[PDB]
């Protein structure tokens, strides 16, 4: 059971020197394309989607939760927090933290989302509650990015993440206003133009969350709205053998382009 698309993804992976994972869901017919779909990959910042969604779920029973202020102290600042660093010795609301984590990949903001959920295990508990048995968040930023090969911490599989991203953005894992808010945030991502988006026709609309970490780990998870047809969900995970390997967003664009050729 190896398709033309899977053979092309294998050829891409062989040329890339790394390990590639892909899961597509076409919501027009619920069909799937999987490449290493059940192998675990380090999530890095793609886990920010699960944390923001878990807070959105909390806000379904607390109408003012997203306006709740959270203190940002100098000691809270973790590498790559361009929004939180403007608010040190001040506050950001949970909505502001969600937007910063999703759209700017603000690490301190992610840590505030994790804390609001009671720790990394609270994010994992939310994943289980929406039917994801695979996702595990074990650490905070920045150590969740160590991406060590063979390490199960802070990993998921492409298959699971694609199914969860569908349920969160297009299904009913969240209330309708909350699903719309998540979609709005993802569509406003600033960090995605070189990843899945770069491999798709420019007329298609994309919301995505990127991730990057050690071992050259380069990830992207996306909901895709092609012109005139039902949306797609696509996840592309990539990781490399050397701890200091460089990012390869072009490999995710290449995977997305192969996927799009098969439609």
**CATH code of 11's domain:** 3.40.710.10
Question: Which conformational region is residue 75 in: left (phi greater than 0), alpha (psi within -120 to 50 degrees), or beta?
Answer: alpha
Q: What are 259's two structure tokens?
A: 């996927």
CB-based contacts of 89: which residues, under 8 Å, 6+ apart?
A: 72, 73, 74
Structural contact between residues 122 and 143, judged by C-beta atoms closer than 8 angstroms: no
Q: How far is CA 220 from CA 6, 46, 165, 212, 243, in A?
A: 19, 7, 12, 9, 19
User: Residue 145 — φ and ψ, nearest 5°?
Assistant: -100, 5
- Find out whether the peptide bond into 163 is cis, omega within 30 degrees of 0: no
**Looking up tokens 């062989």, which residue turns up?**
14
Sign of CA dihedral 66, 71, 73, 76: negative
d(CA 103, CA 31): 29
* Count of structural domains within the chain: 1
Domain span holding position 12: 1-263
98 burial via Cβ count (<10 Å: 0-12, 13-18, 19+): buried
Q: How far is CA 188 from CA 94, 99, 143, 160, 206, in A?
A: 17, 9, 26, 24, 9
- Compute the residue count for the chain: 263
Distances (CA, A) of 21 to 6, 96, 110, 125, 260: 11, 32, 24, 24, 16
Rounded to whole angstroms, the Cα distance separating 206 from 53 reads 18
The residue behind tokens 């092609």 is 226
141 labeled part of a ligand binding site: yes
Resolved by? X-ray
Task: Write the CB contacts of 263 (distance below 8 Å, at least 6 apart in sequence).
Answer: 26, 226, 232
3-state secondary structure the chain: CCCHHHHHHHHHHHHHCCEEEEEEEECCCCEEEEECCCCCEECHHHHHHHHHHHHHHHHCCCCCHHHCEEEECHHHCCCCCCCHHHHCCEEEEHHHHHHHHHHHCCHHHHHHHHHHCCCHHHHHHHHHHCCCCCCCCCCCCCHHHCCCCCCCCCEECHHHHHHHHHHHHCCCCCCHHHHHHHHHHHHCCCCCCCCHHHHCCCCCEEEEEEEEECCCEEEEEEEEECCCCCCEEEEEEEECCCCCCCCCHHHHHHHHHHHHHCC
The reply to whether 89 sits in an annotated binding site is no
- 8 Å CB contact between 137 and 50: yes
Q: Active-site positions?
A: 45
């Amino acid at each position: 059971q190896t398709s033309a698309v899977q053979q092309k993804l294998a050829a891409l992976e062989k040329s890339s020197g790394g390990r590639l994972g892909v899961a597509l869901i076409d919501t027009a017919d619920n069909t799937q394309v999987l490449y290493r779909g059940d192998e675990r990959f380090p999530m890095c910042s793609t886990s920010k989607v699960m944390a923001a969604a878990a807070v959105l779920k909390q806000s379904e029973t607390q109408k003012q939760l997203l306006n709740q202020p959270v203190e940002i102290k100098p000691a809270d600042l973790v590498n790559y927090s361009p929004i939180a660093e403007k608010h040190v010795n001040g506050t950001m609301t949970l909505a502001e933290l969600s937007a910063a984590a999703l759209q700017y990949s603000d690490n301190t903001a992610m840590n505030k989302l994790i804390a609001q959920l009671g720790g990394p295990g609270g994010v994992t508990a939310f994943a289980r509650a929406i039917g994801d048995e695979t996702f595990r968040l074990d650490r905070t930023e920045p150590t969740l990015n160590t991406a060590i090969p063979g390490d199960p911490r802070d990993t998921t599989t492409p298959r699971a993440m694609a199914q969860t991203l569908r349920q969160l953005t297009l299904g009913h894992a969240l209330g309708e206003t909350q699903r719309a808010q998540l979609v709005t945030w993802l569509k406003g991502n600033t960090t995605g133009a070189a990843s899945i988006r770069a491999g798709l026709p420019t007329s298609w609309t994309v919301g995505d969350k990127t991730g990057s970490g050690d071992y050259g780990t380069t990830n992207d998870i996306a909901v895709i709205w092609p012109q005139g047809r039902a949306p797609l969900v696509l996840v592309t995970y990539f990781t490399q053998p050397q701890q200091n390997a460089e990012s390869r967003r072009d490999v995710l664009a290449s995977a997305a382009r192969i996927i799009a050729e098969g439609l």
